[PDB]
């Protein structure tokens, strides 16, 4: 089997991407944030504290003839941006782009933190990291990908995120028309539950490539590119007037700037992030100070190849017995 679904930026800055997901019988379609940095599929629901719902579409298990309470199961998750959610669990039929899993754990939120409430466009998350990170207790549950894997034509999914435009998540096949050149594959460590890999280095604009190992994760659920302070300083040093602002919470730059590109290494291959991808706009409405899309990972504890990096590539998440990651230009 295969599936193919379009993923759409939530706003003009590509702050995140939403993909329609069918849950239950008859189908309830929710727009979920596909997140290769976590492993819970959770939704706003009829059980979510009413004051914490503000415009989201909710899953109502009582209206689904295939929903079953997973008795005794609870979940609770805290993310790297300080947000969180928790609740109980149902199993139900879940379909993405024509690909169906029966008995998928659908984690129903009873509580969500303010940033989730405040974002009306995201109805929940669909985790695509390794199932070892799943938070359901006392019986850990599998991700949608893990459940689908054996049925897929090939045990893979691909992320093809757009810049200011829709893109595609495919399950079970590699669309050879969706990228240019060849796909370069690189090793993955699953030890921390993430799609963790090692970039072979970087360049800033038309500068020389620096060969250096940068361990990090491919995370579709993080917006920006978070790298070591040395690398980030080297980038922003090429932008007149750019500076790190503790009050704002990262590097800012004059909105009048033309940003240089940023290249990262995948083995002997190179992925080029155009400068425009690194512009996240005014820090507040009407400001001439703009927020940068490359930020320091210092204090996060891990480097994160978030959407800013991934959207410059066609990315293969290869879930074969020994997982790997593939990157191609597009």
Curated annotation (Swiss-Prot):
Name the protein family: Belongs to the peptidase A1 family.
Q: Does the keyword Signal apply?
A: yes
Which of UniProt's keywords are assigned here? Aspartyl protease, Disulfide bond, Hydrolase, Protease, Signal, Zymogen
Question: Carries keyword Disulfide bond?
Answer: yes
**GO BP, sorted A to Z:** proteolysis
Query: What EC class does the entry list?
Result: hydrolase
Q: What is this protein called?
A: Endothiapepsin
- Provide the E.C. number(s) assigned to this enzyme: 3.4.23.22
Cysteine pairs bridged by disulfides in the record: 255-290
- What are the catalytic residues? 35, 199
Gene name of the record:
EAPA
**Superkingdom of origin:** Eukaryota
User: What sequence ranges are listed for the domain Peptidase A1?
Assistant: 17-328
Query: Which part of the entire protein is covered?
Result: 90 to 419 of 419
List the catalytic activities from the record.
Hydrolysis of proteins with specificity similar to that of pepsin A, prefers hydrophobic residues at P1 and P1', but does not cleave 14-Ala-|-Leu-15 in the B chain of insulin or Z-Glu-Tyr. Clots milk
Q: What GO molecular function annotations does the UniProt record carry, in alphabetical order?
A: aspartic-type endopeptidase activity
